[PDB]
Ligand binder design. Structure first.
Ligand SMILES: [Mg+2]
Length: 548
């Protein structure tokens, strides 16, 4: 219910900036994200929101990450991170949005509106940690953020340049020190030591073969990976070659590299100098996504995307849980979207003998569902993912008495994985260490990993429609309620093709629907995708009103 000097300082500091034309803002997944010259007042609003989130939650540290991830050099973005390093509570997105869309002259009053609607205790100082990627606009935007935090009399720490996962790491640590489940030392240094020490344990008595060439998107992941390498152990046989670390030139960020580029264009970066069979990976620009790839013997680009990594991780955890003797005690499952290749799902259920849960798209539904297992593996094709360990999981690992040196070795190994794998957020660097460790333990070349199952040919298409809003989905977005008859037709179309599977869903932003289709052969997959694409387009063109 306070205060006068704060209201004044808020509206005064706001008067430094101006709202772009008639821009309407929305805090989506990953927050606000757009052209960097539209972003001053938006980041201001988030500085203000952050103050309120911290105070509502007893002065716990709340994080802000300034990044636009995959996006080109001239975008930026801003998102809040909650106390345990988790993504901002779904219902607080709407507050961010209310603040962003306010006229500036009124922003001090909308702040008051919120301290009353949210019911915040003003005893506590707000505490916020922030960091940014390598973008040119970062410095200016950090100044905007800092003017907001100052007007609110928050305590803040500028953690400088970090990957997104490092900023989730810090937040969680700061809020867990003194606790029973201390996540680590809340510094970049502590992040490195924790990864190093865990990698070391997982790697006991085994060796990585051949080098790893890591495309770092010319992003913050590049210098952080290099810094991490200084902390890693010596006789693991890890040999990381860093490429695309041109962080000094903002124009280079995500320019024809790394992860998003490789995944969506399904080819290596054009600048790549890797040879035949060289094991490779691409990080995205804020290093929360990764994928693997290689040129095979005949010189063909071979992608190993998020789903590939998911089945790799699930195979490894499954084998370890069994030999640790806890596989019957613990619920272990893979969480996927409907975008997952059918062959990947088949491998999990038939060969790994583990549940798969199809859930709605968006890390939120994926994480929430992975937390229903004791050991929940989720990746998206795009390279975002992690493994979640429940308290039960940690406890039964920590407490079970082993009946053999193999059983003990597996339990130790499993314990280490728990500290290696980022629990707050999908972490490209952590995931990298994971994949390398697993390949070492299995003795697998990239080609043996690819050979594990064969993807059904698939095709994704973007279908423009009149109104995105008439396409209403359910059952992990695999079925349409609306418009009438479309599902019946999708059902019939997929039946005509060997192992034929297709589904269409709205994008949620555009006036477009996405069609996914897969089948036994290329021509089938393409034809099915086109047929569903035409039906979608047909049901999505304005009906047309008759006369007399
Ligand atoms: Mg990212």
């Amino acid at each position: 219910m306070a205060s006068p000097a704060v209201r004044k300082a808020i509206s005064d500091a706001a008067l430094q900036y101006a709202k772009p034309e008639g821009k309407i803002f929305q805090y989506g997944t990953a927050g606000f994200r757009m052209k960097a010259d539209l972003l001053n007042t938006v980041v201001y609003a988030v500085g203000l929101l952050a103050t309120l989130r911290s105070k509502k939650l007893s002065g716990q540290w709340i994080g802000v990450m300034v990044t636009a991830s995959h996006n080109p050099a001239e975008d930026n973005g801003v998102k809040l991170v909650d106390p345990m390093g988790e993504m901002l509570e779904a219902e607080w997105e709407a507050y961010a949005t209310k603040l962003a869309n306010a006229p500036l002259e009124n922003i001090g009053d909308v702040y008051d509106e919120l301290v009353k609607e949210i019911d915040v205790s003003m005893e506590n100082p707000a505490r916020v940690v922030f960091a940014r990627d390598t973008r040119a606009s970062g410095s200016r935007l950090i100044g905007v953020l800092s003017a907001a935090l100052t007007a609110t009399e928050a305590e803040f720490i500028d953690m400088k340049f970090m990957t997104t996962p490092q900023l989730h790491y810090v937040v969680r640590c700061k809020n867990t020190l003194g606790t029973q489940y201390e996540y680590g030392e809340p510094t970049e240094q502590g992040y490195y030591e924790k990864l190093a020490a865990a990698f070391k344990r997982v790697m006991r008595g085994v060796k990585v073969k051949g080098s790893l060439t890591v495309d770092c998107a010319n992003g913050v992941g590049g210098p952080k990976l290099r810094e991490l390498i200084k902390y890693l152990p010596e006789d693991t046989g890890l040999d990381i070659k860093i490429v695309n670390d041109d962080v000094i030139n903002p124009d280079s960020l995500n320019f024809e590299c790394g992860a998003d580029y490789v995944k969506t264009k399904q080819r290596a970066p054009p600048s790549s100098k890797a040879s035949i069979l060289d094991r490779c990976a691409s990080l995205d620009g804020d290093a929360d996504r990764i994928l693997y790839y290689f040129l095979d013997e005949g010189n063909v680009f071979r992608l190993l995307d998020g789903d590939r990594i998911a089945t790799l991780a699930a195979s490894f955890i499954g084998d370890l849980a069994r030999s640790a003797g806890i596989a019957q005690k613990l619920k272990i499952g893979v969480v996927q979207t409907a975008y997952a290749n059918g062959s990947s799902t088949e491998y999990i259920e038939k060969v790994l003998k583990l549940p798969s849960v199809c859930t709605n798209t968006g890390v939120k539904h994926l994480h929430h569902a992975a937390m229903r297992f004791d050991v929940g593996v989720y990746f998206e094709a795009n390279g975002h993912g992690t493994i979640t360990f429940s308290e039960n999981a940690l406890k039964t690992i920590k407490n079970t008495e082993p009946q053999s040196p193999a059983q003990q070795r597996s339990l130790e190994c499993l314990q280490a994985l728990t500290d290696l794998i980022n629990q707050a957020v999908g972490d490209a660097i952590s995931d990298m260490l994971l994949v390398e460790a697993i390949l070492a333990h299995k003795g697998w070349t990239p080609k043996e990993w690819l050979a594990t199952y064969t993807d059904l040919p698939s095709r994704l298409v973007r279908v423009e429609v009149a109104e995105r809003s008439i396409f209403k989905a359910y059952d992990a977005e695999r079925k349409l309620e609306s418009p009438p008859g479309l599902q019946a037709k999708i059902d019939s179309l997929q039946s005509r093709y060997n192992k034929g599977r297709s589904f269409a869903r709205a994008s949620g932003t555009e006036d477009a629907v996405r069609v996914y289709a897969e089948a036994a052969s290329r021509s089938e997959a393409d034809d099915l995708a086109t047929r569903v694409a035409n039906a979608v387009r047909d049901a999505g063109t304005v009906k047309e009103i008759l006369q007399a």
